[PDB]
Structures are given as C-alpha cells and as structure tokens.
Design a protein around this ligand. Structure first.
Ligand code: BLR
Ligand code: BLR
Lengths: 303, 303
C-alpha cells in the first residue's frame, strides 16, 4: 500500500477557520456548504443548501460579487469582497473562488483586523522582498534571503528551503529560525516524508497553510444527488491528510505553511514554515506576498 | 562640446504637475519650494520658505508623516500620505521622499481619483504581470510580454524594449502599439540619442516620466544661503533636458515614460513608452507596477 496511495484531494472536509461553498453556474445556487457555517456565517447548512448566493449578500455588494463569480477571469479577480448580511448585521470576508473539475468553489475567510489600508502590506512586502532577493549573488544567498524574508512577514518560528534530489529525497539547505526552534539545517529526509501524490498536488497548487494542527474537520454537506467526493485540490481550506497532522504533532509543530518552488515545470523544493509555539493564522495579504516571492525565487532558479 | 556634457541633474526646475519641497533634518523646515506651489498647494513660496512642514499638515496625519520623514528607512515607507490643510479644506497628495547629497526632498503629487481601494490595482498588476512574464520561454517572448503588459497598464500609444549594444547604440527589439503609432520595431539609433550622462543617471534612477512635453518649468526657490544647485538625480519631478523635449516634439511625441533594464549592475536597455495622442499622467500605483515589472524582467535577464 505505502505512502503514495492515500488520495488527499478528496477528504470530504475542510479546516474550520473558513467556510467552503460550492455554487452552481450560472445561477449561483449553493449545492455544497461546509457544516461549520453556523459558527462562521450565522446560517445552518439547511438554510444554505439550495438557496441562491445573492440571498445572503448585502445588496450593494451583491451585483459586483455575482458578476465576478460568473466572470471566468475569476482570479485574476480574487480576492472577492464578500459581505454576509445574516440578521443583519454584516460580516466581512475575503472570498477566494476557483473552478475545478466542473465545480465553482467559493472559500470564505474572515476579513483581517483593521482599518490598516487594504493591500498596502502586500505592496511593501513584495517591493522590499524583491530587492532583497535581487541582492543575492548565488543560489545559497537567494535561499537565505527568501527564508529571512518569509519568516519576517509571517512570524513563523522556522522557515527553511527544502530541496528535492533526483529521487525526491529532501535536504534542508537554508534555515531562518527563532532560537526556540531546533535547527534542521543540513538534515536530509527520505522521499516518503512528502509522498508522491502530495508532490504531484504541490506541482499544481503552490501554497498550503495549516494554521493549527488541532482542528475538528468540518464536513462538506451537499444537496441530494450532489456530492460525490468534492475534488479539493485547489481549495485553500482543504483538510490535510491525517497522517501528516500526526507527523507534525510528533515533530512538535503546531502550525505549518509551505510554498512550492518550481523549475522547468517540475517541483524543485519547498519554502516550508513551522510554528513550534501556538497557532499561525497568516493573513491573506501576507500569504499572497509570500507566494509571490516564491514565484520570483522560482523564476530566478535559472543561471 | 557634444551630447554627453549638458548636466541634466541640476536643471533648477521641476515639471509643474507636482510640488517639490526640500526639508531640513531633523527639524523639517522648508528650505526650498517649487514656485508652482500656489496652483498646487494653495500657498506661496513666501509662506512656505522657512516654515516647518507640520504647520501645513492636517493634525491627525502630522505625527506619522513627520515620523516617516525622519525615519531613514524612508521608502521603504513611500508613498507617504500627505494631507495639506491650507484654508482649510484638505488637499490629498502622495509624497515620495528621498535623501540625496545631504538633502531631504519631498515630492507631492495629487492623490488619484477614487475611492477605488488603495493598492488593489498594484496587487493585480504585478500578480497578473508576473505570471505573463514567467510564461515567456526566451528573451524575445519576455520582451513582447513586458511591452504588452506595460502598454495595457498605462494606456500608452507605444511601448518598446530598447536594447543597447556594445557601444551604446540602441535597437528597438520589441514593440506593442496602437495602430495610430508608426512602427519603430527593428530600427537602430546612434548612441548619442541617449547620451552618456543620461545613461549614467538611468543606471541609478530606474524610472522617468514626462506626462506632457509642453510645460512651463517651475523654478525651485530657496531660502537665502540655500540653493546652490539642487541635485535632482532621484527626483521624479525633475525637469528634463530641453533638447530631449525638442527631440520628442520633432518625433511627434506628446508624452513619454521609460524604465531602465539592468543586467550585472549595468544598463542593458529601456522599456520606453510614448504617446502620440495627448498627455499621459500615469498614476502612482501604475508607474510603480510598471517599474516593478522592469525589475522582474531585469532579474530574468540571466540564462
Ligand atoms: C507515508 C505517509 C507519510 C509519512 C511516513 C510522513 O512522514 N509524511 C506522510 C505523508 C504526507 N506528508 C505530507 C505533506 C508534507 N510533509 C512535509 C514534511 C516535512 N515538514 C518539515 O518541516 C520537514 C523537515 C524539516 C519535512 C521533511 C511537508 C513540508 C509537507 C507539506 C505540508 C506542510 O507544509 O506542512 C502529506 C500531504 C498533506 C496534505 O497536503 O494533505 C502526506 C499525505
Ligand atoms: C546631443 C543631444 C541629444 C540628441 C541629439 C538626441 O537625439 N537626444 C539628446 C539628448 C538627450 N536624450 C535623453 C533622454 C532620452 N532619449 C531617448 C531616445 C529615444 N526615445 C524613443 O522613443 C526612441 C526610439 C524609438 C529613442 C532613440 C529616451 C527614451 C530618453 C529617456 C527619456 C524618455 O523616456 O523620454 C536625455 C536626458 C533627458 C533627461 O533625462 O533629462 C538627453 C539630454
């Protein structure tokens, strides 16, 4: 059987800090809703399933949101501004929507604290980060620049560059760390620690975040006739493989984030961040800044 | 005498769509002010020279603005939010401040129309642009991607990649254009069209914009004992060489913007945009998005 066979893209559940909805097209009827929607949204699955999205959206946000969800050209439009009028009292969310395997999936994460101008942090993060990455004169300086930059933006206890060999064993070739985190720099690990179906998924979906490894997976409920396993390959809230969560627990890690490094269309390595402390709910603008720096580093893996 | 000798970094004047101030440190006393300040700011040079900056700033913006100007770490903090309370009635500006040759220069450009969330356009421009640049498989596709991207963001009639040879002659190696603009693709030009002191300045200051070639230069006035030619090398409002403005007039160009392409610390080429139509007051977020794409392209000039 071994490591490579557990699926991972169809867990049937999400990480409960956000809500996952599936929307029909073109009508935007909710055909799936994750069952943590009462805690996060103020509505039940029963109120949600089969209702049109617009019924729950503050009316002045509604028309542009529906226009974006139908756009196809959908991020490029992410993040979507979603304002949920429940009882009502608005709740504010960043929507990340995508199409995959014929379904339109909308993920909702509570909008960040502040007031502190939208997208200003991303502007500074990628400008300052790009010039630090360009200062690097070789691969090893590039790696150290990225890991210092990502740890600064996220606050993670540890950030490494994890590089794959021929073979798919990995090596910790650069590390930035708080002093509370043991040093993994220089360690090599077998290929099965990131098994083959994970590596294949990470060639397509370049960012994953587990802000706490202790969560109760929120099942995705569906209208009768619907689900059938939801392919969650491109969903940021996808519940991750339980055996990886026990790897993290045994390693003493409470939260994780990694970013794929690509070279010639093939997975080259990861930027891997870990928290030994407590949780790490990285905000949207920070995650996206980090993933953007991973793309820059990936494009600089040349000569 | 010839082309290489006219200075260009000390014209004594600026392009009048913004205001240039020089500030003492640490006290932020205005020692220089451009003479278009009545039109743009609502104050005269006489009211400005020798007054502390804070006297003109809306009080809730004032402390953070002064903190930034003293920071050193100054962009990284650009753009500064500057709210000018004159009579009073607030006016809103993006401040771009820099230190050079011992002076602290603050340039003020009216804040953009809207309402349309700050920095959202930059977020989308650099994300969408980076992935189009990464799609390029060789230098020629890179060049065509950049020129299509920059023309899309700015609306310029023409955008070219202008590459320097051994020698500093130039070649138009890629072009995107409205059909109203004659094609320069494939043309070669002598080194003197971008003379040596311009090329040296452009190795240090990677962006220049002339939103209309028909402007009355606004003299920079100074307190007695002060100016002495203000070195405007890193100032975005620097009035450009009059002979270049007549080159543009004869070429039939009403507005221009170029971005330096760097390779191994040496000027490699320019992204050059021209308007045959009318003016081109490119907004701050667009200019910065374009310059960021120029840095990415510069970093990809490798192998
Ligand atoms: C055969 C089953 C598995 C064994 C044994 C094992 O050790 N992992 C197994 C399955 C598995 N791993 C992952 C994802 C994963 N694994 C890592 C490994 C590391 N994290 C570190 O900090 C270090 C060394 C310092 C290593 C090595 C990483 C980075 C990841 C990516 C996720 C993350 O960033 O935390 C999966 C997929 C989990 C999922 O995507 O659902 C599986 C099934
Ligand atoms: C000896 C004096 C000069 C002669 C003769 C001439 O032709 N230019 C001279 C001086 C000069 N040029 C510049 C800056 C400059 N020149 C160009 C040239 C081109 N623009 C085009 O569209 C093309 C071809 C399609 C060419 C060739 C460019 C792009 C620039 C940069 C400024 C801009 O983007 O418009 C200067 C410096 C002007 C300044 O920075 O003050 C000078 C003195």
């Amino acid at each position: 059987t071994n490591c490579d066979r557990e699926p991972i893209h169809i867990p049937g559940a999400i990480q409960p800090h956000g809500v996952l909805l599936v929307l029909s097209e073109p009508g935007l009827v909710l055909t799936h809703a994750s069952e943590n929607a009462p805690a996060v949204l103020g509505n039940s699955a029963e109120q949600l399933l089969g209702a049109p999205l617009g019924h729950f959206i503050e009316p002045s946000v509604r028309e542009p949101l529906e226009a974006d969800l139908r756009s196809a050209r959908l991020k490029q439009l992410n993040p979507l501004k979603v304002v949920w009028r429940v009882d009502g009292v608005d709740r504010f969310f960043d929507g990340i929507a995508h199409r995959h395997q014929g379904r339109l999936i909308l993920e909702l994460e509570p909008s960040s604290h502040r007031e502190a101008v939208p997208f200003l942090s991303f502007f500074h993060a990628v400008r300052d980060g790009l010039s630090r990455l360009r200062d690097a004169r070789d691969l090893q300086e590039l790696c150290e620049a990225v890991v210092q930059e990502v740890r600064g933006l996220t606050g993670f206890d540890r950030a490494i560059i994890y590089r794959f060999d021929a073979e798919w064993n990995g090596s910790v070739i650069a590390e930035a760390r708080d002093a509370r985190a043991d040093p993994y720099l220089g360690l090599h690990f077998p290929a099965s620690d990131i098994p083959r179906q994970a590596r294949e998924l990470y060639q397509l979906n370049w960012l994953r975040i587990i802000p706490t490894i202790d969560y109760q997976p929120a099942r995705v409920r569906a209208l009768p006739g619907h689900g059938e396993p939801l392919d969650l390959s491109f969903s940021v809230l996808r519940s991750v493989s339980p055996i990886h969560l026990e790897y993290l627990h045994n390693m003493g890690v409470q939260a994780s984030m990694s970013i794929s490094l690509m070279k010639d269309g093939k997975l080259w390595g990861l930027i891997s961040c870990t928290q030994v402390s407590g949780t790490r709910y990285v905000p949207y603008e920070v995650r996206t800044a980090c993933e953007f720096l991973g793309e820059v580093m990936s494009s600089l893996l040349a000569a």
